Design a protein around this ligand. Structure first.
Ligand SMILES: *Sc1ccccc1C(N)=O
Ligand SMILES: *Sc1ccccc1C(N)=O
Length: 134
């Protein structure tokens, strides 16, 4: 419903900040942290009706989620967590909460200028991933 018009398309990762400390906070093990930290994924976003699809294409992994805003779904993350995810819109920001093993992390996706900025927070620790159009 014109839901994500400014986000639809293909985006390539151009910069990352604080990746390692965020992944440590999440509980990701050494080898996965090191290998995952090299990746420069593309993020492919599309919308069909009420269904939003976000794919990540990478040398580390490929992942895909499809969802309806507000409606919880199962997600196996790139680091192999089995989480319950709920994604909503808050003032133009896509807010994605992942719950697993009594833990929680929040991933926010927004547009700033010609960038797509992703901010992920686990307790006090934030990582920022900046994407540009591919
Ligand atoms: S609708 C959408 C889809 C993907 C990333 C971000 C957003 C958003 N902030 O509206
Ligand atoms: S924001 C972030 C940072 C580090 C790993 C993964 C992510 C993400 N879910 O986009």
């Amino acid at each position: 419903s014109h839901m994500c018009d400014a986000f639809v398309g293909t985006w390539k990762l151009v910069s990352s900040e604080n990746f390692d400390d965020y992944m440590k906070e999440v509980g990701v093990g050494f080898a996965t942290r090191k290998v995952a930290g090299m990746a420069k994924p593309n993020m492919i976003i599309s919308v069909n009706g009420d269904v939003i699809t976000i794919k990540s294409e990478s040398t580390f992994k490929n992942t895909e989620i499809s969802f309806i805003l507000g409606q919880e779904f199962d997600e196996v993350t790139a680091d192999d967590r089995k989480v319950k995810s709920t994604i909503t819109l808050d003032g133009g920001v896509l807010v994605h909460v992942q719950k697993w093993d009594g833990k929680s992390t929040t991933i926010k996706r927004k547009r700033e200028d010609d960038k797509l900025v992703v901010e992920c927070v686990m307790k006090g620790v934030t990582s920022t991933r900046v994407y540009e159009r591919a």
